[PDB]
Design a protein around this ligand. Structure first.
Ligand SMILES: *[C@@H]1O[C@H](CO)[C@@H](O[C@@H]2O[C@H](CO)[C@@H](O)[C@H](O)[C@H]2NC(C)=O)[C@H](O)[C@H]1NC(C)=O
Ligand SMILES: *[C@@H]1O[C@H](CO)[C@@H](O)[C@H](O)[C@H]1NC(C)=O
Lengths: 66, 67
């Protein structure tokens, strides 16, 4: 059940691998969150996960993730 | 031009042609450098990062790959 969610994430990163400047290469013009840490840490938690701050915080099915 | 260092640093200001008492305020000099910076950099094989006007920040970076 969870190994097929991890493969779901892998093939999201494989589809985004067809851009000379890979999309986890630069900051989104620059998001303070993204400005802190790095673009990679931003592409995973925001651009890919749209992660919350708690397990008590569930939201909307991420269409691209689905 | 003042304060030439081996770092290749120095300070400059501008005056009116035939008037040493007339000093162009920085704001106008910043605007002029912003207008002609592509040309000034190309005249020195420099790229804004190599040629830095402290107090004048480059703001022309359009990012776009997948429409
Ligand atoms: C040269 O520039 C100086 C500085 O702008 C001029 O001095 C000013 O001139 C104006 C106009 O006469 C006066 O209102 C100011 O009170 C002057 N004081 C300053 C700002 O220094 C000067 O007149 C200019 N003269 C020439 C020969 O161009
Ligand atoms: C998910 O993304 C939406 C915008 O599409 C945003 O409003 C929401 O706060 C995000 N949720 C989390 C927890 O990141």
């Amino acid at each position: 059940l969870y190994y097929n969610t991890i493969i779901s994430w892998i093939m999201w990163y494989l589809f985004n691998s067809f851009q000379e400047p890979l999309p986890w290469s630069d900051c989104p013009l620059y998001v303070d969150e993204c400005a802190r840490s790095s673009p990679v840490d931003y592409f995973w938690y925001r651009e890919t996960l749209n992660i919350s701050t708690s397990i008590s915080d569930s939201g909307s099915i991420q269409w691209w993730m689905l | 031009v003042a304060n030439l260092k081996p770092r290749i640093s120095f300070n400059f200001f501008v005056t009116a042609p035939k008037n040493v008492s007339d000093i162009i305020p920085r704001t106008e000099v910043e605007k002029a450098i912003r207008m002609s910076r592509s040309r000034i950099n190309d005249a020195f094989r420099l790229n804004d990062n190599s040629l830095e006007f402290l107090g004048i920040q480059p703001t022309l970076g359009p990012p776009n790959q997948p429409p």
